[PDB]
Write a protein that binds this ligand. Sequence first.
Ligand SMILES: CCCCCCCC(=O)N[C@@H](CO[C@H]1O[C@H](CO)[C@H](O)[C@H](O)[C@H]1O)[C@H](O)[C@H](O)CCCC(=O)/N=C/CCCc1ccccc1
Ligand SMILES: *[C@@H]1O[C@H](CO[C@@H]2O[C@@H](C)[C@@H](O)[C@@H](O)[C@@H]2O)[C@@H](O[C@@H]2O[C@H](CO)[C@@H](O)[C@H](O)[C@H]2NC(C)=O)[C@H](O)[C@H]1NC(C)=O
Ligand SMILES: CCCCCCCCCCCCCCCC(=O)O
Ligand SMILES: *[C@@H]1O[C@H](CO)[C@@H](O)[C@H](O)[C@H]1NC(C)=O
Ligand SMILES: *[C@@H]1O[C@H](CO)[C@@H](O)[C@H](O)[C@H]1NC(C)=O
Ligand code: NA
Lengths: 266, 201, 239, 98
Amino acid sequence: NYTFRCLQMSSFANRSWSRTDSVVWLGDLQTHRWSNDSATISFTKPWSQGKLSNQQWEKLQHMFQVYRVSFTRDIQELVKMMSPKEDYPIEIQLSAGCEMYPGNASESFLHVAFQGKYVVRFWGTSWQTVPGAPSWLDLPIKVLNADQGTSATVQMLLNDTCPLFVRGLLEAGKSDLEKQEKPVAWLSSVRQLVCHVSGFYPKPVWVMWMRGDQEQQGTHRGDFLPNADETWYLQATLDVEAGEEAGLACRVKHSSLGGQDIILYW
Amino acid sequence: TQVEQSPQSLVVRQGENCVLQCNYSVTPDNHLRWFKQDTGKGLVSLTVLVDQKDKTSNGRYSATLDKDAKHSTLHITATLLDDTATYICVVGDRGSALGRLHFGAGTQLIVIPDIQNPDPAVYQLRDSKSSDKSVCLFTDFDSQTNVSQSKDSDVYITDKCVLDMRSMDFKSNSAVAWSNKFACANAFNNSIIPEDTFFPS
Amino acid sequence: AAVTQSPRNKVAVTGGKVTLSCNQTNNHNNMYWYRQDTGHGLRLIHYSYGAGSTEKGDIPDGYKASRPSQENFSLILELATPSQTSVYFCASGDEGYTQYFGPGTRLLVLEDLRNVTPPKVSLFEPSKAEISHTQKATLVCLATGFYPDHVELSWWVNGKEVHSGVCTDPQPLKEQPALNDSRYSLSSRLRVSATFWQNPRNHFRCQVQFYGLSENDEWTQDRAKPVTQIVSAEAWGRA
Amino acid sequence: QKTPQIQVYSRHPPENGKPNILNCYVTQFHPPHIEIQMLKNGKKIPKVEMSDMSFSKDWSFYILAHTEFTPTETDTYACRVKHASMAEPKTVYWDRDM
Ligand SMILES: CCCCCCCC(=O)N[C@@H](CO[C@H]1O[C@H](CO)[C@H](O)[C@H](O)[C@H]1O)[C@H](O)[C@H](O)CCCC(=O)/N=C/CCCc1ccccc1
Ligand SMILES: *[C@@H]1O[C@H](CO[C@@H]2O[C@@H](C)[C@@H](O)[C@@H](O)[C@@H]2O)[C@@H](O[C@@H]2O[C@H](CO)[C@@H](O)[C@H](O)[C@H]2NC(C)=O)[C@H](O)[C@H]1NC(C)=O
Ligand SMILES: CCCCCCCCCCCCCCCC(=O)O
Ligand SMILES: *[C@@H]1O[C@H](CO)[C@@H](O)[C@H](O)[C@H]1NC(C)=O
Ligand SMILES: *[C@@H]1O[C@H](CO)[C@@H](O)[C@H](O)[C@H]1NC(C)=O
Ligand code: NA
């Protein structure tokens, strides 16, 4: 059950300085990358084109190449329209894509954020603001909804292109997505005992401090932190009194270990 | 210069068709509009094409747009004298007010009017305030005649010009000549005027 | 969705202030100023997205804009140059793409106003022979001695303007082509049925709207101040 | 404006003399203009690979900085971060035993 995200971020510093960069994720694997610096979108995987032919990719990337230039100009003009109400610096973020379910079921989204606040989404047939959004955005939204061409294209992209494309990606990237890399663990202290776990994919993992059979309820699991090689890092910390570290261990369960859990006795 | 039109200028006889070309490099190309502009006056919209492959009509004017090609044509059927005008091509890059219009420099059309019943003559006309001042009106000739500026620079002669009496479906070329220092028999010596020109009195 | 411009025509001197005004009762947020010049398409000078806003277009140099209200968008030239001789066009529109254009404003910036002069207008009555040969009467009007060439000749019958049966020279001819600041002449014809000419209740009038100096332009010379004015000539029919 | 959370951590279990990769993971900041250096002994490491910038569901940005390193008893490693939200640069140190 996977989610495809096209995360775009745009930063307008002056009237005449901006940049827009994009990255694309399928679950937690990056599949595309588009620097302001490059005229073209880059694949970060072998299978990033999906089941699309070369001709369909060209047509699709050209749409984006024109989007980026047009997007930049529009924003710059929309600033001029609202001036002096909102001025630079301006940060703009899109989050666009489609979550995929079994059968044919999908849900496509396109959320826009302004200065870090989610303000606009594309819904059904048009752009609309969301609860909390300023009232001044009604003029921008009225102007963006005036552009019937953009609306039709965006409708096609959300309703058809995204789910078709992602169904393609999932077949082509099957082996990288179903990947099974094993965690490696190690111990340390500072007393707070730390069980480091690293190298594991996919993201679901279980880490507990075990005094033999009994689970130590004080085990504080941290955040999942990324490694560079598209695997994960996690550490669980237990808080103890000194001299009490005998008969204590860290048990780690993961899909790749195949029943054979990692046990580190301290 | 992202919008180029062709031909730059062209001359046709009444009743004949013509085709006007517009090629453009503008990106994107939301819509293309064709304007008509009479000399002196301003911009009458004739049509606007919006689709990837679009076709429009408006009476005797029809037009095409192919966006892959970035190419449009305006076809004028059965040209009338009033079609004499400059025809201008405009490409808008958005479907909203955020867009910029990119204008071609226009294609100038001249339509030569059909003169069914020529009756060439050179009449003298007198001033309503002063019977001693006068002009010479060469008129009722057909489109195959040319009028030339005078040899004597103290004589003045205007170029040919067609008028249209609408009530009677009647058109007539005409030109004027006058001078301080001269008479209407000698006024248009320096033009090749028809053998059967009526010089009265 | 209508848009007006004023003045419709203007003669100015180099260094003078010229203001070209554009009015619009559509409640359109957005207004735009272009200039038309032979060998180019219309080019954007300034535009506005509402009252208080003015933005630079593609060729803004020499021009200030001003949007005092939703209704008015002005184009201000502080120090007019000869290169700003053009035909200016204002337009407006709401959030959509269509820009609704005004009728246009001709501007001529001269180096110097010394030779500005209004026309003498003469009306020439139809030829007896034309009447009898054709059953048609051709009036001829003659604007003469005027400079610069900014005139609008119009034909008026019983206080209403007539276009049918008119033709006017497409350009004025020079009275002394040898000289650099030559005066101009212009001619026009009105043709009607002999019946119509032979009615002495029909009042004919040739009108020339010369564009020249304004009230507030300085005038050093002895001769009458060659202001923007109407000069005309006039004749009735007769059986 | 939000203050960035820096977390320094090694890829493989540390061992003095054995090659490894050191990761500096900067998160939860806004705006995205951010300067990251990885430091050895307080000097700038030359070959620091940076991942592309991305953001989480809360619209907060994140970015993974990393580079090769052999750890030693005698060498310190750190991640220095300049950002508008902070008056002066925050520097967090790799703790080995953590
Ligand atoms: C990410 C998926 C979007 C894909 C859009 C593809 C269509 C596109 O590129 N539209 C272009 C160009 O449009 C023009 O050309 C096309 C032909 O290619 C067509 O003819 C169009 O009709 C024509 O207009 C238009 O420029 C749009 O406007 C840019 C929309 C910016 C966008 O996504 N904005 C969303 C909200 C920003 C909210 C915001 C504004 C101001 C301050 C605070 C927040
Ligand atoms: C495309 O689909 C929308 C409805 O889909 C929803 O909105 C999408 C942007 C995406 O988020 C989906 O996952 C959502 O389920 C259609 O919108 C409807 O259109 C009709 C008019 O034709 C209108 O009466 C409805 O109110 C619209 N629905 C909503 C929820 O607003 C749209 O027509 C589709 N367009 C095309 C070209 O396929
Ligand atoms: C963003 C619109 C949703 C539809 C997504 C279909 C995208 C298929 C190919 C990946 C596109 C990579 C370009 C990202 C575009 C961007 O946000 O700049
Ligand atoms: C534009 O913004 C950038 C931001 O880094 C700055 O370096 C540049 O000097 C600015 N230019 C102008 C003209 O304000
Ligand atoms: C981003 O890209 C555009 C066009 O590719 C360019 O004009 C602009 O200067 C770039 N800005 C930066 C900061 O790289
Ligand atoms: Na121009």
